[PDB]
Design an enzyme around this catalytic site. Structure first.
Site, PDB file in Angstrom:
ATOM      1  N   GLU A  29      -6.005   6.598  -0.257  1.00 35.67           N
ATOM      2  CA  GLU A  29      -5.249   5.955   0.809  1.00 35.67           C
ATOM      3  C   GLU A  29      -4.923   4.510   0.466  1.00 35.67           C
ATOM      4  O   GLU A  29      -3.866   4.004   0.861  1.00 35.67           O
ATOM      5  CB  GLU A  29      -6.021   6.029   2.127  1.00 35.67           C
ATOM      6  CG  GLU A  29      -6.279   7.439   2.626  1.00 35.67           C
ATOM      7  CD  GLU A  29      -5.047   8.089   3.223  1.00 35.67           C
ATOM      8  OE1 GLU A  29      -3.934   7.562   3.023  1.00 35.67           O
ATOM      9  OE2 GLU A  29      -5.192   9.131   3.901  1.00 35.67           O
ATOM     10  N   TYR A  46       3.190   0.952  -0.196  1.00 31.07           N
ATOM     11  CA  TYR A  46       3.998   0.410   0.892  1.00 31.07           C
ATOM     12  C   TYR A  46       4.344  -1.047   0.632  1.00 31.07           C
ATOM     13  O   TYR A  46       5.472  -1.480   0.889  1.00 31.07           O
ATOM     14  CB  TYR A  46       3.261   0.560   2.221  1.00 31.07           C
ATOM     15  CG  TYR A  46       3.111   1.991   2.675  1.00 31.07           C
ATOM     16  CD1 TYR A  46       4.179   2.877   2.610  1.00 31.07           C
ATOM     17  CD2 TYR A  46       1.897   2.462   3.149  1.00 31.07           C
ATOM     18  CE1 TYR A  46       4.044   4.189   3.023  1.00 31.07           C
ATOM     19  CE2 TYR A  46       1.750   3.770   3.559  1.00 31.07           C
ATOM     20  CZ  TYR A  46       2.825   4.629   3.494  1.00 31.07           C
ATOM     21  OH  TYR A  46       2.672   5.930   3.909  1.00 31.07           O
ATOM     22  N   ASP A 104      -0.627  14.067  -1.602  1.00 31.57           N
ATOM     23  CA  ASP A 104      -1.984  13.701  -1.216  1.00 31.57           C
ATOM     24  C   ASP A 104      -2.265  14.113   0.221  1.00 31.57           C
ATOM     25  O   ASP A 104      -3.339  14.647   0.521  1.00 31.57           O
ATOM     26  CB  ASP A 104      -2.193  12.194  -1.378  1.00 31.57           C
ATOM     27  CG  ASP A 104      -2.143  11.740  -2.822  1.00 31.57           C
ATOM     28  OD1 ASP A 104      -2.361  12.568  -3.730  1.00 31.57           O
ATOM     29  OD2 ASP A 104      -1.878  10.543  -3.049  1.00 31.57           O
TER      30      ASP A 104
END
Ligand SMILES: Cc1cn([C@H]2C[C@H](O)[C@@H](COP(=O)(O)OP(=O)(O)OP(=O)(O)O)O2)c(=O)[nH]c1=O
Ligand SMILES: Nc1ncnc2c1ncn2[C@H]1C[C@H](O)[C@@H](COP(=O)(O)OP(=O)(O)O)O1
Ligand SMILES: [Mg+2]
Lengths: 109, 357, 357
Positions: free
Chosen positions: C115, C122, C237
């Protein structure tokens, strides 16, 4: 799978290989010296153990090994390899380290 | 209390490393300390997997080893499996509820993640040299010679985790919990964090590097070379890890990040010295167990204990601690290989006559 | 209390997923539930870095977008940055102190680490399509339409973290903390864990897939294609993530792991249903905000709200919950591209004469 290998001492007899004998000899020769390494000498010896290996061939190999480590960064190896060689020459001529009396030697020679 | 997404819109560049506002938005376009952003990028680039290493020859070498050299190798492997087992979870459990800047949060998670690859590679090595790995793993928890050192390292993590729970639930102050009085001091919490980071630095920069010496000593004899390939990749990671704890410790100690932390560092300077020295004595003690049944070419008790004292002085000086051992040259210089990436025939007779014999 | 290395030698195969003895030695040669071991290997095999994707062309496409399409794209990006910001830290903080088997511990750490790669990507996308990334990041914490669901999602994590801390500090029983009475029920802790996992399942299997529709709808127009490659990697993912939470939820619900947990799952079935319905209703409202200023080719309020109902029914059935919406065919089938993956001239006159005209 321990094989229990044998080494041949100077007097022809055999015993179990014991690396602490090599450790003590090198530690003796490197005493007081700077920037030397017992570990380096043993690993650079590339000593090939076989059952029945002569103890003199073992010692003559680690002499060459310490001799080849004489360098600008580690100059005190000139004394490490010398002490190993002086030690080797004592055994070759006398069978021990301590030399005999001056008179006793001249008589025999 | 701890929140997974704090509502306050704070300037993350002005927060401290720890105990500030819990990180909300995870951004990586800016950093307060770019050392952790560089450590992240560097750890991601080193990403490796254990299966990409050929360890097939290692099963033959291991079975051929003398009985006591089997002992040295497998004991060093069990101890490694133990230390990186703690390191897999502990930075995530003990540090994540305290970090307050994003670049340090993500580094700690990257740091912890890379440790799980180490834990998996230990399983890979073990299952490729022994017949029943369960014999090896079950001895890690029950063998009396290993677990003694486990509780020394885990305690610093456990005590920091506990105070953090009190600090989030009750907040700072004097409290009564089931009648009994419970005092929650942030200064005593910053003290437990600092001591814990000191323990981890000695773990990753001293304890493991003592273990690296054993794995690479087999490789200098061209033995167990598949294990050595993996340990070399691990050592490259471990160099990033200890750099992280060094930068945290030095930023905390200099008061650059938290002025209060500078004095707290001085109140611990004695504890941290005794903490590092203890680690060295513990590893020196561990070496006595490795060579209890004999030594090998290039490594014995004295050589390894000398390396313990040699590497300890270096690590302790890096974090502003007094050297506890005598000055010494590197007793195993070979380890540095693994821890880093005619005649001009013309004459002039006229010029010769211009000369007096 | 929680320990980073428990001294007791437990058979890790007989431990439960949660609330058993804290994991000590990290081994990967055996598993109680091998679904998490497979998820680890598959996540490790998917390892990617954001910079390996070319996002330079995306800047031209973005500036050419209509004003309301810049809004649709950038709002979906802030929401993505938000959700995966929570997902970066939360599985490590909320689940590691509860896990009791090694394969599930390492998966949660791998899950969380992967993550952080999303959060880094991003930042990569943002800094390559806008001129000042600070404009986007500073709006994430304060945004009206985001912060409503940000605090809603984080609460399930926060409440689980809080009860976990009391359970480690005080243990089960009725306690007194500063006069006020505090009851610590393990059954109520198992209830907060279950509700949290349900919320995380709805977060990763519904909320994000609504976002995938927006990111990939631009890609079907050959726009923002560098972003699409990264979101496509994220989607690969994300399928692994929700499978993990699906297996956790179904193992808890079926009583395979904990007999007590089977009953607790039934007492929550109504809350979990309302939890999913609320999430689905929130995304439809979020869809209403996206197209407030107009729609784009292939996506408007109706289309996206239809996908919400479509993807919600699928997810809720996967965890044994009643379907809240009408049966529907996939309203955006194009999204699946991004989420998954002479003559034998011889005659026989005899055989022909064997025939009556
Ligand atoms: C000459 C000398 C040697 N030594 C060291 C070097 C040698 O390792 C050892 C003497 O060698 P030896 O007496 O030959 O001992 P050894 O270990 O080879 O055993 P043995 O021959 O009985 O099987 O002591 C000293 O400590 N002091 C000295 O003055
Ligand atoms: N049991 C043993 N196994 C292997 N090497 C040995 C040994 N005993 C001695 N050595 C090594 C150490 C010395 O460097 C070298 C010469 O030793 P020495 O003391 O001169 O010979 P010895 O002990 O055979 O009389 O042999
Ligand atoms: Mg002798």
């Amino acid at each position: 799978m321990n094989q229990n290998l044998l080494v041949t001492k100077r007097d022809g007899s055999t015993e179990r290989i014991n690396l602490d004998k090599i450790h003590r000899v090198l530690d003796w020769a490197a005493e007081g010296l700077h920037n030397v390494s017992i570990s380096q000498v043993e690993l650079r010896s590339h000593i090939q153990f076989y059952d029945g290996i002569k103890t003199s061939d073992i010692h003559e190999t680690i002499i060459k090994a310490a001799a080849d480590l004489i360098s600008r960064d580690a100059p005190d190896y000139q004394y490490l390899a010398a002490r190993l060689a002086i030690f080797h020459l004592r055994k070759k001529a006398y069978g021990q380290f301590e030399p005999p009396a001056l008179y006793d030697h001249v008589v025999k020679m | 209390a701890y929140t997974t997404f704090s509502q306050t819109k704070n300037d993350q560049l002005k927060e401290p490393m720890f105990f500030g506002q819990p990180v909300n938005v995870a951004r990586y376009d800016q950093q307060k300390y770019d050392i952790f952003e560089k450590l992240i990028e560097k750890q991601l680039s080193f990403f490796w997997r254990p299966e990409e290493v050929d360890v097939s020859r290692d099963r033959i070498d291991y079975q051929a080893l003398p009985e006591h050299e089997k002992h040295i190798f497998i004991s060093n492997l069990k101890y490694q499996t133990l230390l990186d087992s703690i390191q897999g979870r502990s930075p995530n459990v003990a540090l994540l509820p305290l970090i307050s800047i994003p670049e340090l949060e993500t580094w700690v998670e990257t740091w912890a993640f890379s440790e799980t690859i180490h834990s998996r590679s230990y399983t890979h090595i073990i299952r490729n040299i022994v017949n029943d790995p369960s014999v090896v793993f079950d001895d890690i928890v029950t063998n009396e010679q290993i677990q003694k050192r486990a509780e020394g390292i885990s305690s610093y993590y456990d005590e920091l985790i506990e105070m953090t729970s009190y600090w989030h639930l009750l907040g700072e102050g004097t409290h009564t919990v089931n009648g009994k009085t419970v005092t929650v001091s942030l200064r005593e919490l910053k003290k437990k964090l600092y001591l814990c980071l000191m323990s981890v630095n000695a773990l990753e920069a001293i304890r493991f590097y003592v273990s690296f010496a054993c794995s690479f000593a087999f490789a200098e004899r061209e033995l167990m070379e598949g294990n050595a390939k993996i340990i070399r990749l691990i050592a490259r990671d471990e160099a990033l890890h200890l750099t992280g704890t060094q930068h945290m410790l030095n930023l905390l100690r200099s008061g650059a990040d938290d002025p209060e932390m500078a004095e707290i560092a001085e109140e611990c300077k004695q504890e941290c010295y005794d903490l590092f020295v203890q680690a060295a004595q513990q590893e020196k003690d561990w070496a006595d167990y490795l060579f209890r049944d004999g030594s090998m070419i290039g490594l014995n008790k004295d050589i390894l204990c000398q390396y313990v004292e040699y590497i300890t002085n270096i690590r302790m000086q890096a974090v502003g601690l007094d050297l506890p051992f005598q000055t010494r040259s590197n007793p195993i210089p070979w380890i540095n290989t693994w821890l880093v990436s005619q005649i001009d025939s013309e004459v002039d007779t006229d010029d010769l006559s211009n000369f007096q014999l």
